[PDB]
Design an enzyme around this catalytic site. Structure first.
Site, short mmCIF file in Angstrom:
data_model
loop_
_atom_site.label_atom_id
_atom_site.label_comp_id
_atom_site.label_asym_id
_atom_site.label_seq_id
_atom_site.Cartn_x
_atom_site.Cartn_y
_atom_site.Cartn_z
CB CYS A 65 40.45 -47.71 8.20
SG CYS A 65 42.25 -47.71 8.01
NE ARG A 68 39.54 -44.54 10.90
CZ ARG A 68 38.48 -44.12 11.60
NH1 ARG A 68 37.93 -42.93 11.34
NH2 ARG A 68 37.92 -44.92 12.55
CD1 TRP A 237 51.04 -51.44 7.66
CD2 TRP A 237 51.89 -49.68 6.52
NE1 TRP A 237 51.05 -50.34 8.53
CE2 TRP A 237 51.59 -49.27 7.85
CE3 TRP A 237 52.45 -48.74 5.63
CZ2 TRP A 237 51.76 -47.95 8.30
CZ3 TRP A 237 52.68 -47.41 6.09
CH2 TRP A 237 52.35 -47.05 7.41
CD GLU A 242 44.22 -56.26 6.79
OE1 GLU A 242 43.38 -55.97 5.86
OE2 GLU A 242 45.34 -55.67 6.96
C1 HEM Z 1 48.65 -47.87 6.25
C2 HEM Z 1 48.24 -49.12 6.72
C3 HEM Z 1 46.80 -49.47 6.86
C4 HEM Z 1 46.39 -50.45 7.69
C5 HEM Z 1 47.36 -51.24 8.54
C6 HEM Z 1 44.98 -50.56 7.56
C7 HEM Z 1 44.23 -51.51 8.26
C8 HEM Z 1 42.92 -51.84 7.89
C9 HEM Z 1 42.21 -53.01 8.35
C10 HEM Z 1 42.81 -54.14 9.17
C11 HEM Z 1 40.96 -52.97 7.81
C12 HEM Z 1 39.84 -54.02 8.04
C13 HEM Z 1 39.87 -54.97 6.83
C14 HEM Z 1 38.89 -56.12 6.95
O1 HEM Z 1 38.53 -56.52 8.10
O2 HEM Z 1 38.41 -56.65 5.90
C15 HEM Z 1 40.85 -51.71 7.12
C16 HEM Z 1 39.66 -51.27 6.55
C17 HEM Z 1 39.69 -50.17 5.71
N1 HEM Z 1 40.77 -49.33 5.41
FE1 HEM Z 1 42.52 -49.30 6.20
N2 HEM Z 1 44.52 -49.66 6.65
C18 HEM Z 1 45.56 -48.95 6.20
C19 HEM Z 1 45.58 -47.99 5.17
C20 HEM Z 1 44.44 -47.60 4.46
C21 HEM Z 1 44.42 -46.66 3.38
C22 HEM Z 1 45.64 -46.01 2.79
C23 HEM Z 1 43.08 -46.44 3.01
C24 HEM Z 1 42.54 -45.54 1.99
C25 HEM Z 1 43.20 -44.41 1.53
C26 HEM Z 1 42.28 -47.33 3.86
C27 HEM Z 1 40.90 -47.39 3.82
C28 HEM Z 1 40.23 -48.41 4.54
C29 HEM Z 1 38.81 -48.66 4.27
C30 HEM Z 1 37.89 -47.90 3.34
C31 HEM Z 1 38.46 -49.75 5.01
C32 HEM Z 1 37.09 -50.42 5.09
C33 HEM Z 1 36.76 -51.23 3.83
C34 HEM Z 1 35.37 -51.82 3.89
O3 HEM Z 1 34.37 -51.17 4.28
O4 HEM Z 1 35.27 -52.99 3.50
N3 HEM Z 1 43.15 -47.96 4.72
N4 HEM Z 1 42.06 -51.02 7.20
C1 LIG Z 2 33.25 -55.77 -1.93
N1 LIG Z 2 32.97 -56.07 -0.50
C2 LIG Z 2 31.85 -57.03 -0.42
C3 LIG Z 2 34.11 -56.65 0.25
C4 LIG Z 2 35.27 -55.74 0.65
C5 LIG Z 2 36.03 -56.19 1.72
C6 LIG Z 2 37.14 -55.45 2.15
C7 LIG Z 2 37.49 -54.26 1.50
O1 LIG Z 2 38.59 -53.59 1.96
C8 LIG Z 2 39.14 -54.06 3.19
C9 LIG Z 2 40.37 -53.24 3.30
C10 LIG Z 2 40.42 -51.96 2.76
C11 LIG Z 2 41.58 -51.21 2.88
C12 LIG Z 2 42.70 -51.73 3.52
C13 LIG Z 2 43.88 -51.02 3.63
C14 LIG Z 2 44.96 -51.60 4.29
C15 LIG Z 2 44.82 -52.90 4.85
N2 LIG Z 2 45.86 -53.49 5.53
N3 LIG Z 2 43.66 -53.59 4.70
C16 LIG Z 2 42.61 -53.04 4.07
C17 LIG Z 2 41.48 -53.79 3.93
C18 LIG Z 2 36.76 -53.80 0.39
C19 LIG Z 2 35.64 -54.55 -0.03
CL LIG Z 3 43.42 -59.11 2.04
#
Ligand code: HEM
Ligand SMILES: CN(C)Cc1ccc(OCc2ccc3ccc(N)nc3c2)cc1
Ligand SMILES: [Cl-]
Ligand code: HEM
Ligand SMILES: CN(C)Cc1ccc(OCc2ccc3ccc(N)nc3c2)cc1
Ligand SMILES: CN(C)Cc1ccc(OCc2ccc3ccc(N)nc3c2)cc1
Ligand SMILES: CN(C)Cc1ccc(OCc2ccc3ccc(N)nc3c2)cc1
Ligand SMILES: [Cl-]
Lengths: 362, 362
Positions: A65, A68, A237, A242
């Site tokens: 992420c 963060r 947000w 994305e």
């Molecule tokens: C506040 C604005 C936030 C932005 C702009 C943001 C941005 C992103 C982006 C762009 C990704 C990559 C998504 C992808 O390529 O599929 C991501 C991954 C992630 N974000 Fe954030 N995020 C935010 C907030 C959060 C919050 C609030 C949480 C949890 C409390 C979170 C947990 C994660 C996790 C766990 C992933 C990885 C998911 C995975 O392994 O598939 N994010 N974030």
């Molecule tokens: C179930 N997996 C195979 C796919 C999988 C892909 C993205 C996932 O989360 C991406 C993700 C997680 C948290 C986010 C928070 C904010 C944001 N703008 N994008 C965010 C995007 C979770 C599962």
């Molecule tokens: Cl999405």
């Protein structure tokens, strides 16, 4: 054995959490209480403070992420008290309303009762609470291909989509003890959507593209001190890429680049013209413009990476090791224009954290 | 000990090479000969066939290279016979002429005598045979910052650059036994350069950008069957993003995006306008257009990735394991529009291969 793993995870989590909270003297007694609770009961219950700080640490430790920097301002809603499908449905509806906040999006997580002995109390089927259906049959593709399997599962349970390209999937979840999940249509008053228009190309609206305001990821497990919150949806947000570089551009998603190229007036005939790249930039400009114009929070990838730089600096200043997954942190457009591209990151997994879990359909 | 490592590497290389060449019956006798040669001499000498196939296998095994489809057509020039600095200089000049081929670039490697006991026979100081000088002193930056340390080293040895932004560095190399390297100015008749213009924006030429035609990487070591060819420069043709997304765009290189934004008529004031991205696309279009117009080989990143897909397929069909470094294989612009982004690659190192080695200055 199970008590063993649990107690170990607990000692490590409580020590770190209480240290960060300035409550370090309270650890010995809290661990005593936890110890006896595990013996008698098989597990333990987090205080509101522990659960809140634990969810925030999980976000802080999410290697993939870029968002963060804001980890400490996560709004944590404790719904460990729900017991009925109507309470779960209403909590999910509330999360959407309160996270949306009329467009000024609040990063929020709603935490439902944890697994007790690996037995889920609530099992959410949605990947996100708000997501579009997808259909494929006899040559014909409608909607979001990434939603085909959940869509087919919903229709097995008597939901029927209108088969637009943007049908909202119903909330769908299962309660402990029920053989089948239940579903509930989303009230349209709760769901903000943004039509996609371009700041200077008027023809762009001919594409009739839109996307929803708030990504609320609802199929990950929150693990904190050995307690497994398998149902704990959260949102931030969007970062504009994305939507514009992936959901609307990927060939296995909405696949809109050839259509974008046509409306912006360039040929889509030769790779050396870089028409896909040019279309990607105009689509991504349109996405940012449209969210901003509607008053819905969004961040662009340059500003996001600048925020992530300040997170790296804050980690160093706090004496915390930084972990990151370079392959997810780089943006899918202009990655080398961000500082992220030019450094490496340690992909170690630190807990508390959010984790994939097996889907209950397919 | 040294003989040991060598013989082991030799047995493995000869077995694999001869197998690929359909000469598998010849292995036993060739290994016998090599065995006795190592005992008597401390090393062994590759046949012309082994050295040629070994250089081609090294390219085939280069995890970070997207251009590997063409591995088997590498033009291998065997210069193991040189003994004088005038012969080395002339071989280097010849490589440039023959690789350039009037713009129809031929991937070529020239192989100089290998290290004997870790003692280099020839030590090339250039990173590439054709590269621009860079200068920094009292606030003032000229030329290519990535060349500052080699530039300063050249000027220590009595070369003097004109201090344009595009001075060609001299060839600079050292012969075994000499305390100091020698340098030789490149004949300008040998070096093709391409002025950068845009297919539709006439003002683009106001930037007065140019780049050289042929990237000839001259500071890597070729390792084949335990023999270390530390001097073995090679070239392909450019992929346009190396020039347009990195050499001309990086802040620590020529840093031209703000200037590009101004000449294409867009503001460079707000991140949400994605002006850096838009400038990157127009710069990269210009680079491709300019090379094509001048009749100098170049490939765009979409076509390159399509070629790389056919390399992956050819590997599978040959029953060869594919290795790759995802972080170098994705292009720095629109990476998610290529198939590379959406798969993973095994980053194992297989020999023969090309390797970094320590620089002799700094
Ligand atoms: C506040 C604005 C936030 C932005 C702009 C943001 C941005 C992103 C982006 C762009 C990704 C990559 C998504 C992808 O390529 O599929 C991501 C991954 C992630 N974000 Fe954030 N995020 C935010 C907030 C959060 C919050 C609030 C949480 C949890 C409390 C979170 C947990 C994660 C996790 C766990 C992933 C990885 C998911 C995975 O392994 O598939 N994010 N974030
Ligand atoms: C179930 N997996 C195979 C796919 C999988 C892909 C993205 C996932 O989360 C991406 C993700 C997680 C948290 C986010 C928070 C904010 C944001 N703008 N994008 C965010 C995007 C979770 C599962
Ligand atoms: Cl999405
Ligand atoms: C024929 C056209 C070729 C193209 C278009 C091509 C493309 C590229 C690109 C874009 C890179 C990444 C460069 C960077 O990000 O700094 C690369 C890396 C590399 N290429 Fe190729 N290449 C070609 C031919 C060759 C040849 C002929 C060889 C050797 C015989 C070679 C060996 C390598 C190696 C060793 C690397 C990685 C260097 C490192 O680790 O820094 N390539 N190639
Ligand atoms: C811990 N650091 C001192 C070491 C370190 C820093 C950046 C590193 O790479 C960043 C990086 C990632 C991908 C690349 C792709 C192409 C290219 N030319 N350079 C690229 C550079 C690797 C190691
Ligand atoms: C000495 N290292 C710290 C830097 C270093 C960076 C790139 C290097 O080669 C990149 C490279 C190698 C071979 C190529 C062949 C063709 C092409 N278009 N680009 C190519 C680019 C070698 C060393
Ligand atoms: C061997 N394969 C079956 C497993 C495999 C395939 C692709 C993988 O990832 C590609 C990849 C790389 C970077 C990404 C960045 C963001 C994102 N949403 N997906 C991304 C996806 C990982 C594992
Ligand atoms: Cl280069």
């Amino acid at each position: 054995e199970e008590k063993e793993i649990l107690w170990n995870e607990a000692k490590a989590f409580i020590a770190a959490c209480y240290q960060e909270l300035g409550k370090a003297a309270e650890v010995k007694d809290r661990l005593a209480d936890i110890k006896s609770e595990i013996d008698l009961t098989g597990s333990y219950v987090h205080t509101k403070e522990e659960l809140e700080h634990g969810a925030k640490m999980a976000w802080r430790n999410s290697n993939r992420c870029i968002g963060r920097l804001f980890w400490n301002s996560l709004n944590v809603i404790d719904r460990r008290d729900v017991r009925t499908k109507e309470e779960v449905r209403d909590a999910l509806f509330h999360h959407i309303e309160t996270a949306t906040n009329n467009g000024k999006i609040r990063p929020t997580i709603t935490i439902f009762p944890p697994e007790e002995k690996g037995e889920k109390q609530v099992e959410i089927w949605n990947h996100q609470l708000i997501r579009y259906a997808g259909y494929e049959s006899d040559g014909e593709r409608i909607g979001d291909p990434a939603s085909c399997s959940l869509t087919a599962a919903c229709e097995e349970l008597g939901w029927r989509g209108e088969r637009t390209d943007f049908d909202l999937l119903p909330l769908i979840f299962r309660m402990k003890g029920d053989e089948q999940p239940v579903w509930y249509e989303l009230p349209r008053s709760l769901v903000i959507e943004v039509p996609i228009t371009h700041p200077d190309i008027e023809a762009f609206s001919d594409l009739e593209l839109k996307w929803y305001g708030v990504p609320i990821i609802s199929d990950m497990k929150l693990e904190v001190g050995g307690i497994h919150y398998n149902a704990a949806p959260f949102n931030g947000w969007y970062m504009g890429t994305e939507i514009g570089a992936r959901n609307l551009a990927d060939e296995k998603r909405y696949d809109k680049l050839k259509k974008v190229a046509s409306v912006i007036g360039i040929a889509a005939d030769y790779n050396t013209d870089l028409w896909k790249d040019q279309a990607l930039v105009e689509l991504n400009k349109a996405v940012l413009h449209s969210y901003k114009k509607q008053g819905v929070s969004i961040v662009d990838h340059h500003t996001a990476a600048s925020q992530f730089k300040r997170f790296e600096e804050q980690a160093e200043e706090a004496g915390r090791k930084l972990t990151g997954d370079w392959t997810w942190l780089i943006p899918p457009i202009s990655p080398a224009a961000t500082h992220i591209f030019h450094r490496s990151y340690d992909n170690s997994i630190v807990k508390p954290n959010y984790f994939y879990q097996d889907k209950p359909y397919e």
